[PDB]
Amino acid sequence: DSYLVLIRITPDEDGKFGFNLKGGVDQKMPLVVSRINPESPADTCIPKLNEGDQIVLINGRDISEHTHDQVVMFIKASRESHSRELALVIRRR
Amino acid sequence: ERLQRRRETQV
Ligand code: NA
């Protein structure tokens, strides 16, 4: 069955976390990690992000009715925080 | 009913 994982990523020097996103309310699909860049922040945090993970919470925010572009905005905005850390709750099988 | 090509974004 599915389970949740809390993933905390700090972006690299170029402001990148190292993963690709698909999905959003306008895409008729959940938010899904479509690619992990090997050895990037998303690939080397503990626990690490995985391809196929479904993102359900972004820095405490429920994203179930947000568009792809709105979600991308939320992720980039994590880089302006006090620590500039992205905290994802994802769902995995 | 219909489905456009889905966007993918690198972050
Ligand atoms: Na969504």
Residue numbers in the entry:
A (entry chain A): 5 to 97
B (entry chain B): 1 to 11
Question: Anything the authors wrote about it?
Answer:
PTPN3 is a multidomain protein of 913 amino acids comprising a N-terminal FERM domain that determines subcellular localization, a central PDZ domain involved in protein-protein interactions, a short linker of 30-residues and a C-terminal protein tyrosine phosphatase (PTP) domain able to dephosphorylate protein substrates. The human protein tyrosine phosphatase non-receptor type 3 (PTPN3) is a phosphatase containing a PDZ (PSD-95/Dlg/ZO-1) domain that has been found to play both tumor-suppressive and tumor-promoting roles in various cancers, despite limited knowledge of its cellular partners and signaling functions.
Interestingly, viral proteins of oncoviruses, such as the capsid protein (HBc) of hepatitis B virus (HBV) and the E6 protein of high-risk human papillomaviruses types 16 and 18 (HPV16 and 18), possess PBMs that are able to interact with PTPN3. The PDZ-mediated interaction of E6 with PTPN3 results in the proteasomal degradation of the phosphatase. All the complexes possess the classical bonding network of class I PDZ/PBM interactions (S/T-X-ΦCOOH). The C-terminal residues that exhibit well-defined electron density maps start from P-5 for PBM-TACE, P-6 for PBMs of HPVs or P-7 for PBM-HBc until P0 (see peptide sequences in Table 1). As expected, the C-terminal carboxylate in each peptide forms three H-bonds with the amide nitrogens of F521, G522 and F523 of the “GLGF motif” on PTPN3-PDZ. At P-2, the S or T side chains form H-bonds with the Nε2 of H572 at the N-terminus of the α2-helix of PTPN3-PDZ, which is conserved in class I PDZ domains. In PBM-18E6, on the contrary, the side chain does not contact the PDZ domain.
